[PDB]
């Protein structure tokens, strides 16, 4: 058996800003909106290698993912991430948001910086939509390395909630109801359950609840991109 070939051919390191924009408010998602309790939990994630999976669709929630989903607590997730030692480059953290939605002139969108290198060229994170039985948003294994042996300049992604598979409640404020055995992580849909706040008998996509912006802010070290990248962001 040979070691698998390297998937990322970019050189040196790159630094990114992750900014998280909530779009989940009583105005955009009126049905049973939790007017008093609504929040986003702290953001937790990391830049990492292919050898570590924080969460993935069709995967089972780790203990740390479960505690984010149910408690809004990033503490066990952060322990799990740090236990991966060299498979993780940067630990990503940003603060909780109470209430969940404000205009940008009122409150800055939470952000964090992270680094990538040839081996830790992926990024994952999650945050809990609260209150909820077990509903998060996030990205899993977003790749910052390009085929051209460079580093992506900007990624913009709109998000819908996903279900961590650990609690069977049907709406934001449902009583605790352990899902046993735990089920696979899956996205929410507009036909999950008639009491779901996202239910629409006509089906169709769920209105996005957040947008994430990932922007490159620096590169370091000799570069080996096969197309020009003359952005003046290489630090000496
Ligand atoms: C979810 O929240 C995000 C963050 O506020 C929203 O993104 C922002 O949306 C507006 C579009 O109305 C963007 O401003 C506009 O940009 C275009 C540039 O092409 C310009 O022509 C307009 O005059 C205006 O300046 C803004 O760039 C964008 N912010 C981002 C991406 O960070 C998003 O629309 C929200 N979605 C919903 C459905 O509420
Ligand atoms: Ca669930």
Numbering used by the authors: 192 to 427
Which sentences from the paper describe this structure?
F-spondin is a multi-domain extracellular matrix (ECM) protein and a contact-repellent molecule that directs axon outgrowth and cell migration during development. F-spondin is an extracellular matrix (ECM) protein with multiple domains, including an N-terminal domain (reelin_N domain), an F-spondin (FS) domain and six thrombospondin type 1 repeats (TSRs). The reelin_N domain and the F-spondin domain (FS domain) comprise a proteolytic fragment that interacts with the cell membrane and guides the projection of commissural axons to floor plate. In this paper, we present the crystal structure of human F-spondin FS domain.
The core of the FS domain has an 8-stranded β-sandwich fold, with strands β4, β1, β8, and β7 forming one β-sheet and strands β3, β2, β5 and β6 forming the other sheet. The first major variation of the FS domain, as compared to a common C2 domain, is its long linker (38 amino acids) between β2 and β3 strands, which actually forms two anti-parallel α-helices, packed against the β3/β2/β5/β6 sheet. The second variation is its long linker (51 amino acids) between the β7 and β8 strands. The three consecutive cysteines (C199, C200 and C202) before the β1 strands form three disulfide bonds with C336 and C340 from the β6-β7 loop, and C415 after the β8 strand at the C-terminal region, respectively. None of these disulfide bonds is located within the core of the β-sandwich domain. There is one N-linked glycosylation site (N214) at the end of the β1 strand in the FS domain. The common pentasaccharide core of the linked glycans is visible in the electron densities. Associated with the short strands at the top of the FS domain, there is a solvent-accessible Ca2+-binding site, formed from D325 (from β5-β6 loop), D354 (from β7' short strand) and D358 (right after β7' short strand). The homology of its core structure to a common Ca2+- and lipid-binding C2 domain suggests that the F-spondin FS domain may be responsible for part of the membrane targeting of F-spondin in its regulation of axon development.
